[PDB]
Amino acid sequence: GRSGVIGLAVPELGQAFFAQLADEVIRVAAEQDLVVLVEQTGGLRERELEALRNPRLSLTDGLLLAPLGLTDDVRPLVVLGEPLFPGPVDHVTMQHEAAARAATEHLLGLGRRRVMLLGAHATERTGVAALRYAGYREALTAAGLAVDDDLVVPVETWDRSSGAEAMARVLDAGVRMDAVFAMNDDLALGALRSLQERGVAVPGDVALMGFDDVADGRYTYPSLTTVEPGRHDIARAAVTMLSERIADAGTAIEPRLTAPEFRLVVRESTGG
Amino acid sequence: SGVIGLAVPELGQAFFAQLADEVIRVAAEQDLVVLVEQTGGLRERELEALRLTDGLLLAPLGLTQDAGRPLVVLGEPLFPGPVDHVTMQHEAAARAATEHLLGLGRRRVMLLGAHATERTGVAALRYAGYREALTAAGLAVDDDLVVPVETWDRSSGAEAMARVLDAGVRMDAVFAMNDDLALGALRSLQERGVAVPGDVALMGFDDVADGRYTYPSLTTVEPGRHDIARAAVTMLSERIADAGTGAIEPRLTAPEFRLVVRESTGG
Ligand SMILES: [Mg+2]
Ligand code: NA
Incomplete structure (x- = not known):
């Protein structure tokens, strides 16, 4: 009966x-x-x-x-x-593809031309990541750019520590980017730390944004560009x-x- | 169940x-x-x-x-x-937090998040620990260093810290009543080029995840x-x-x- x-x-x-x-x-x-x-x-x-x-939720x-x-579902x-x-x-x-296209367009509109996608695999993707990638790729093609696999960086878990780890690793490997679109705010803020600890100016050298608007981004430094979904x-x-x-x-x-x-x-x- | x-x-x-x-x-x-x-x-x-x-x-x-x-x-x-x-051990933790800041050689420690003259509940207990730590170090409480806030959130921390910084209040450390206040305060310090910890040492209370990934990472209390x-x-x-x-x-x-x-x- 209704509870x-x-x-x-x-x-x-x-x-x-x-x-x-x-x-x-x-x-x-x-x-x-x-x-x-x-x-x-x-x-x-x-x-x-x-x-x-399970009757646990009866x-x-x-x-x-x-x-x-x-x-195989219930x-x-x-x-x-x-x-x-x-x-x-x-x-x-959420509008994963349309939002990823608009985010990428925003970065390209600032005059940035080497946009990293932080949180997706460069060659084998599934579900949400696949939709985000499709929007990103659309935007790059519209701006006369081809995807560069060095700029598509997978991350196992979309969390702060994983974004910090991955960002630090690709920076130290010598990958050159001028913008980073992270798959969520947590990834973005982990990336922000790795950028700042290496003395990379944000947004002067690398423009950065997240997705979800859940990190109280008005109060980070710099304040964080994001997408409210x-x-x-x-x-x-x-x-x-x-x-x-x-x-x-x-x-x-x-x-x-x-x-x-x-x-x-x-x-x-x-x-x- | x-x-x-x-x-x-x-x-x-x-x-x-x-x-x-x-x-x-x-x-x-x-x-x-x-x-x-x-x-x-x-x-x-x-x-x-x-x-x-x-x-x-x-x-x-x-x-x-x-x-x-x-x-x-x-x-x-x-x-x-x-x-x-x-x-939670409000008074003891606030005494230990203040002792930590004093141990760095800091002598103008701001308490961000309590009223300077009439306090109740948690804020009163936190203030007591802060005050005892200062007394043990031969320091007296300055009301200009006890800064009240709207609510214990990031916006309020940023707004209150910006107000005291632009006013010219001199502090060498800040003990914020929670991590949200501290994170807001950090932005106000950084946007003004104030070095943390070099000019002002900062800590919070709560051990929220976000404090591990700021730059500087945030000292805190896990209650x-x-x-x-x-x-x-x-x-x-x-x-x-x-x-x-x-x-x-x-x-x-x-x-x-x-x-x-x-x-x-x-x-
Ligand atoms: Mg019952
Ligand atoms: Na004092």
């Missing part, structure tokens, strides 16, 4: 993106007097699967799942990510769609996909 | 998101799920959370000295009845997040099983703290 509880299963709250998304979900849910059970999956496929079927009327480990469900589940499930994602809209769409699914669980709603509008937020790290 | 509630100011605050992550992890170990609510740190919202869950873990910011359901409070001991409190979370969840589990006998007398837990030395105070 008025929805679940939110995310990798971990220690990740700013998920903590901020959770804050927005809780706030929106409270407007229709739902409460939120927050589960952590560690981004592990086995834990994501458990969230869908108090919930439905689930919002942000999967990372899943890609409680009303809305997924926060790219299309994944078949059947009567909705997916709410529509967290408020993501939360509202997710909660609204899930409520609809909870009301139609006994039955008929066609699967939907949506991706809210992004906004570039220009700060000091790219010339603001 | 049993069900507990966790009420914090907001998950957008790094310290609370990190603490929430630990609480949820400990609860999962103990076959508990967690309903998370936000209060904005406002008294009325905190009290309303008290008025689904088998027990509640409340982290208030807005309550000061001036239900039939189990309750554990992360904060100063203010509730009567069979309520357990887990309280005991693992013990806070474990103590809280474990005590709540005890009260839930008791179903209000109040046979367990109220407890006061005080987790151990640790100074984390980074580049902003010299390593």
Whole structure:
């Protein structure tokens, strides 16, 4: 029976993106007097699967799942990510390709011509990274440039320490860049440290930006250019769609996909 | 699975998101799920959370000295009845933090985040430790070095630090009441070409992840997040099983703290 509880299963709250998304979900849910059970999956496929079927989450009327480990699939469900589940499930994602194209256009518009993509593999990519890469590549082609594999730098985990490590390593290997588009703010700020510790001027020598707008970038030094991917809209769409699914669980709603509008937020790290 | 509630100011605050992550992890170990609510740190919202869950873990910011359901409070001991409190070592940690700055040879130590004349709660305890450290070093408190802020956030730290710097106040160190304040202060110092730690040594309190990757990296205090979370969840589990006998007398837990030395105070 209806409890008025929805679940939110995310990798971990220690990740700013998920903590901020959770804050927005809780706030929106409270407007229709739902409460939120927050589960952590560690981004592990086995834990994501458990969230869908284990009686541990029986108090919930439905689930919002942000999967990372899943890609053989299995409680009303809305997924926060790219299309994944078949059947009567909705997916709410971000405009990865369009935002990556606009970010890259911004850097090229500053007169930078050797733009590094920090957080994607140069030859074999999958999912989100593949969409970001497609936007980046579109922008470079439009500016008469070919991709340079030395400028496409994979990173195992999109975190601060990994971005610092990778940035330091490519700088020390002698790779020449004039701008860096990092796949999230955490990567960007790790990169920022490695740049500053090597005396590289930001943005004088290397313009830098992130993605997500979750690092309180107004207060970094330099302040960090980023992309707001529509967290408020993501939360509202997710909660609204899930409520609809909870009301139609006994039955008929066609699967939907949506991706809210992004906004570039220009700060000091790219010339603001 | 049993069900507990966790009420914090907001998950957008790094310290609370990190603490929430630990609480949820400990609860999962103990076959508990967690309903998370936000209060904005406002008294009325905190009290309303008290008025689904088998027990509640409340982290208030807005309550000061001036239900039939189990309750554990992360904060100063203010509730009567069979309520357990887990309280960080504010005074001792502030004394140790101030001693750390004084040990570098600094003699004009600013306290960023407390009122100069009327303080309550946490700020009063922090001030006491700061004041004792200065007294032991033969120093007196200068009210111009005790700087109040809007709220303990990055914007407020940046705004207050910018105001005192542009005013010409002379300091050689800053002890900020939390890492968010310290990170905001760092920007205001850097944008003015003030060397950290060379001109001004800086530290915070909370050990948020972001402080490892600033340049300089931020010296801080880790107030005991693992013990806070474990103590809280474990005590709540005890009260839930008791179903209000109040046979367990109220407890006061005080987790151990640790100074984390980074580049902003010299390593
Ligand atoms: Mg119960
Ligand atoms: Na003094």
